[PDB]
Structure 1
Amino acid sequence: MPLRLDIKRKLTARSDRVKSVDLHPTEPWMLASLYNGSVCVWNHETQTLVKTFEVCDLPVRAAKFVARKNWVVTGADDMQIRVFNYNTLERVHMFEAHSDYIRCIAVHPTQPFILTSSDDMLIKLWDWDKKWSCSQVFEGHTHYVMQIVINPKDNNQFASASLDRTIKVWQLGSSSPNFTLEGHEKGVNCIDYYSGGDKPYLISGADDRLVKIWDYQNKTCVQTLEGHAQNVSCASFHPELPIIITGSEDGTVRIWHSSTYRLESTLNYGMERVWCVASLRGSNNVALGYDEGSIIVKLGREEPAMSMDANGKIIWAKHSEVQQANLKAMGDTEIKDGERLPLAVKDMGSCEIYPQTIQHNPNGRFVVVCGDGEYIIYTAMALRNKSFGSAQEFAWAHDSSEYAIRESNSIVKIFKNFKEKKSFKPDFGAESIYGGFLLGVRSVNGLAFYDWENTELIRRIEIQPKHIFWSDSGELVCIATEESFFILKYLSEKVLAAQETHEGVTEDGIEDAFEVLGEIQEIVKTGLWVGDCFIYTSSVNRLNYYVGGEIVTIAHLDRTMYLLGYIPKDNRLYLGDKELNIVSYSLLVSVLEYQTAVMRRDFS
């Protein structure tokens, strides 16, 4: 299945062998330790350095942020532990815990702890509240302690990896593991945990190119995986998607689906080997140290697929990667604007294709959903497949009765009820296609207007946008185009005549179609037509509607979000997160209308 997916080369740096990486969540800062011996902390967002520290100039193996603590923890292989309060980078304390090359720290978050593993064949626990006591020493070694990871899930219990090939999982009441298991046929480089609390897997790494999965509760190697191209420097659990990240001793990325387990893809930033990895716990952004540098990639959608019937059911599907099996919500009750609400429970669905679009039929009704690149349309109540095919790009014929498609070539065919509509068949350069009332083909950094029955270049305007929302009846239409935004009139009659006369301009489209009413310089988180009113979000998180020459913020939102739906009757807006708590604020549409009409001189 396709990479029609989010992969972003989020941030780059080319550097050295950056051994270690550690994440500051609480503010998405990242800490990295180098084979240089200098460590740096960056705000990636603008490729800006939050702080750098020369902790040692010997390669600095281990790093943590202690967020709770508000301090940042550092260690270099002067075998000393140096502390900074990250709240400057003011350096708090130093002392010598482990006297050999200190490989890893694992931390109890709940409980005030710093766990360390070091090459001394020792794991020591030190207590920060006790002011770096060596509270307890965990031993049962056979070699250098290469890695420690805390099962944070049960913080409390943790697992250890060594290249003598074995793994000890421990209980506090075992300053030794509970047991050791004889994992590798190589060495166990690494041990990692399974994001879910529900089930339990570890992945452990080797360069032997074999992966074993283990279920702790049973205590099995669930299974052992092969296929590989080169010594897997690392392989990781995708915590967002069910995929397997494989990494190599050459810095090869191979992905196997942690569901298909089919090689979904190979990527080369041959920046050489997977030294480190660290992942967003919000499960979406990840960074790995490579030799030639490091790269960070951004990998997410911002939504599920759902569309809401104005009775009041936003039927979404899935949750985040859960089966689609879950749609419904007519609710049953009422409560205060600020306060929160209850859902119903009765799934339908359990599709396979993984979507990223939902769009309702124009009457809510028929949704066409695309995923895996093909479109299943559902008969919804029916839970029937209304229909399917493979896309590239789309417009419903807004009317609620036809649809258009952009074939994964790029040349148009349109179908109304599986009949191609060729009365209209430009196939010009595009960019994207827009439907609605009036046909857009967005092409050649222009947006070009077309008929609905034959094509006509109605108009072309200056540039290309990103999105269109049309007023409801089409009329005044709203196009979202980065920061900036415009509101327009489309004037029919001219066309009728002009057309009759035939002789026109269409390079530009015909200058005798549309008019440019006014423009707001705008940034949109999400946006809305209330009729022709543009009620909109801004990504600056004020919910405003541009009204009357005025834009007013009804309210400003946490941070910005998704517009649940205003079921007008109720006159309220349901606001929607993506975490399935709905908030509602009533307006009263009439008020707007009242305003609309009166200005129009419909005072009465």
Structure 2
Amino acid sequence: MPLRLDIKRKLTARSDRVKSVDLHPTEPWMLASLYNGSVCVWNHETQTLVKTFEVCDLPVRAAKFVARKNWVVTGADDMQIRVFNYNTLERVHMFEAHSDYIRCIAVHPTQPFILTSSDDMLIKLWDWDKKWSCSQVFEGHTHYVMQIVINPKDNNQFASASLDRTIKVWQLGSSSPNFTLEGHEKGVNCIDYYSGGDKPYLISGADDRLVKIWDYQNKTCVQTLEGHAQNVSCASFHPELPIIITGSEDGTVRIWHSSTYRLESTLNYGMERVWCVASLRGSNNVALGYDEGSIIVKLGREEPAMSMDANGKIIWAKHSEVQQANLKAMGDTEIKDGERLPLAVKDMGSCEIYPQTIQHNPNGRFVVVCGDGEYIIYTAMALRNKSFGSAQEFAWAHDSSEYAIRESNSIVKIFKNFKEKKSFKPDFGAESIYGGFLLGVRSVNGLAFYDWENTELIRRIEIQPKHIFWSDSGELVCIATEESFFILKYLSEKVLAAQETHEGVTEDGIEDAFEVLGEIQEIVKTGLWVGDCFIYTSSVNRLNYYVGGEIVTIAHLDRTMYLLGYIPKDNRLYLGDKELNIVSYSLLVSVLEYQTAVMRRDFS
């Protein structure tokens, strides 16, 4: 299945062998330790350095942020532990815990702890509240302690990896593991945990190119995986998607689906080997140290697929990667604007294709959903497949009765009820296609207007946008185009005549179609037509509607979000997160209308 997916080369740096990486969540800062011996902390967002520290100039193996603590923890292989309060980078304390090359720290978050593993064949626990006591020493070694990871799930219990190939999982009441298991046929480089609390897997790494999965509760190697191209420097659990990240001793990325387990893809930033990895716990952004540098990639959608019937059911599907099996919500009750609400429970669905679009039929009704690149349309109540095919790009014929498609070539065919509509058949350069009332083909950094029955270049305007929302009846239409935004009139009659006369301009489209009413310089988180009113979000998180020459913020939102739906009757807006708590604020549409009409001189 396709990479029609989010992969972003989020941030880059080319550097050295950056051994270690550690994440500051609480503010998405990242800490990295180098084979240089200098460590740096960056705000990636603008490729800006939050702080750098020369902790040692010997390669600095281990790093943590202690967020709770508000301090940042550092260690270099002067075998000393140096502390900074990250709240400057003011350096708090130093002392010598482990006297050999200190490989890893694992931390109890709940409980005030710093766990360390070091090459001394020792794991020591030190207590920060006790002011770096060596509270306890965990031993049962056979070699250098290469890695420690805390099962944070049960913080409390943790697992250890060594290249003598074995793994000890421990209980506090075992300053030794509970047991050791004889994992590798190589060495166990690494041990990692399974994001879910529900089930339990570890992945452990080797360059032997074999992966074993283990279920702790049973205590099995669930299974052992092969296929590989080169010594897997690392392989990781995708915590967002069910995929397997494989990494190599050459810095090869191979992905196997942690569901298909089919090689979904190979990527080369041959920046050489997977030294480190660290992942967003919000499960979406990840960074790995490579030799030639490091790269960070951004990998997410911002939504599920759902569309809401104005009775009041936003039927979404899935949750985040859960089966689609879950749609419904007519609710049953009422409560205060600020306060929160209850859902119903009765799934339908359990599709396979993984979507990223939902769009309702124009009457809510028929949704066409695309995923895996093909479109299943559902008969919804029916839970029937209304229909399917493979896309590239789309417009419903807004009317609620036809649809258009952009074939994964790029040349148009349109179908109304599986009949191609060729009365209209430009196939010009595009960019994207827009439907609605009036046909857009967005092409050649222009947006070009077309008929609905034959094509006509109605107009072309200056540039290309990103999105269109049309007023409801089409009329005044709203196009979202980065920061900036415009509101327009489309004037029919001219066309009728002009057309009759035929002789026109269409390079530009015909200058005798549309008019440019006014423009707001705008940034949109999400946006809305209330009729022709543009009620909109801004990504600056004020919910405003541009009204009357005025834009007013009804309210400003946490941070910005998704517009649940205003079921007008109720006159309220349901606001929507993506975490399935709905908030509602009533307006009263009439008020707007009242305003609309009166200005129009419909005072009465």
| TM-score range normalised by the length of the shorter chain | over 0.9
Give the superposition deviation at 1:455: 0.0
Q: Distance in 1 between matches of 2:339 and 2:494?
A: 52
CA deviation profile, 1:543-569 (whole Å, cap 9, x unmatched): 000000000000000000000000000
Give the superposition deviation at 1:462: 0.0
Q: Distance in 1 between matches of 2:290 and 2:136?
A: 35
CA deviation profile, 1:293-339 (whole Å, cap 9, x unmatched): 00000000000000000000000000000000000000000000000
Q: Distance in 1 between matches of 2:366 and 2:11?
A: 40
> What residue in structure 2 maps to residue 352 of structure 1?
352
Give the superposition deviation at 1:81: 0.0
Give the superposition deviation at 1:259: 0.0
Map 1:166-185 → 2, pairs under 5 A: 166-185=166-185
Give the superposition deviation at 1:386: 0.0
Q: Distance in 2 between matches of 1:512 and 1:160?
A: 74
Give the superposition deviation at 1:384: 0.0
Give the superposition deviation at 1:171: 0.0
> What residue in structure 2 maps to residue 424 of structure 1?
424
Q: Distance in 2 between matches of 1:485 and 1:198?
A: 46
Residue 235 of structure 1 pairs with residue 235 of structure 2: yes
Question: Secondary structure of the residue that 1:495 maps to in structure 2?
Answer: helix
Map 1:548-559 → 2, pairs under 5 A: 548-559=548-559
Give the superposition deviation at 1:17: 0.0
Question: Secondary structure of the residue that 1:45 maps to in structure 2?
Answer: helix
Q: Distance in 1 between matches of 2:286 and 2:536?
A: 32
Give the superposition deviation at 1:522: 0.0
Question: Secondary structure of the residue that 2:52 maps to in structure 1?
Answer: strand
Residue 267 of structure 1 pairs with residue 251 of structure 2: no
CA deviation profile, 1:400-437 (whole Å, cap 9, x unmatched): 00000000000000000000000000000000000000
Give the superposition deviation at 1:475: 0.0
Q: Distance in 1 between matches of 2:92 and 2:119?
A: 25
Give the superposition deviation at 1:131: 0.0
> What residue in structure 2 maps to residue 591 of structure 1?
591
Q: Distance in 1 between matches of 2:150 and 2:440?
A: 55
Indicate the percent of aligned positions where both proteins have the same amino acid: 100
CA deviation profile, 1:241-270 (whole Å, cap 9, x unmatched): 000000000000000000000000000000
CA deviation profile, 1:511-568 (whole Å, cap 9, x unmatched): 0000000000000000000000000000000000000000000000000000000000
Question: Secondary structure of the residue that 2:249 maps to in structure 1?
Answer: coil
CA deviation profile, 1:427-474 (whole Å, cap 9, x unmatched): 000000000000000000000000000000000000000000000000
Question: Secondary structure of the residue that 1:2 maps to in structure 2?
Answer: coil
Question: Secondary structure of the residue that 1:536 maps to in structure 2?
Answer: strand
Give the superposition deviation at 1:128: 0.0
Q: Distance in 2 between matches of 1:258 and 1:283?
A: 15
Give the superposition deviation at 1:22: 0.0
Question: Secondary structure of the residue that 2:347 maps to in structure 1?
Answer: coil
> What residue in structure 2 maps to residue 582 of structure 1?
582
Q: Distance in 1 between matches of 2:392 and 2:22?
A: 39
Residue 288 of structure 1 pairs with residue 316 of structure 2: no
- State the 4+ residue runs in structure 1 displaced beyond 4 angstroms: none
Q: Distance in 2 between matches of 1:476 and 1:448?
A: 17
Q: Distance in 1 between matches of 2:89 and 2:74?
A: 11
Give the superposition deviation at 1:490: 0.0
Q: Distance in 1 between matches of 2:44 and 2:473?
A: 44
Q: Distance in 1 between matches of 2:280 and 2:352?
A: 26
Aligned residues: 604
Question: Secondary structure of the residue that 2:323 maps to in structure 1?
Answer: coil
Question: Secondary structure of the residue that 2:583 maps to in structure 1?
Answer: strand
Question: Secondary structure of the residue that 1:569 maps to in structure 2?
Answer: coil
Q: Distance in 2 between matches of 1:502 and 1:51?
A: 67
Q: Distance in 2 between matches of 1:67 and 1:391?
A: 46
Residue 73 of structure 1 pairs with residue 66 of structure 2: no
CA deviation profile, 1:257-296 (whole Å, cap 9, x unmatched): 0000000000000000000000000000000000000000
CA deviation profile, 1:331-355 (whole Å, cap 9, x unmatched): 0000000000000000000000000
Q: Distance in 1 between matches of 2:165 and 2:585?
A: 59
> Unaligned regions of 5+ residues in structure 2, if any?
none
CA deviation profile, 1:10-46 (whole Å, cap 9, x unmatched): 0000000000000000000000000000000000000
CA RMSD of aligned residues (A): 0.0
Q: Distance in 2 between matches of 1:376 and 1:594?
A: 41
Give the superposition deviation at 1:362: 0.0
Give the superposition deviation at 1:48: 0.0
Give the superposition deviation at 1:72: 0.0
> What residue in structure 2 maps to residue 466 of structure 1?
466
Q: Distance in 2 between matches of 1:339 and 1:374?
A: 40
Give the superposition deviation at 1:100: 0.0
Give the superposition deviation at 1:160: 0.0
Question: Secondary structure of the residue that 1:477 maps to in structure 2?
Answer: strand
CA deviation profile, 1:130-187 (whole Å, cap 9, x unmatched): 0000000000000000000000000000000000000000000000000000000000
CA deviation profile, 1:369-395 (whole Å, cap 9, x unmatched): 000000000000000000000000000
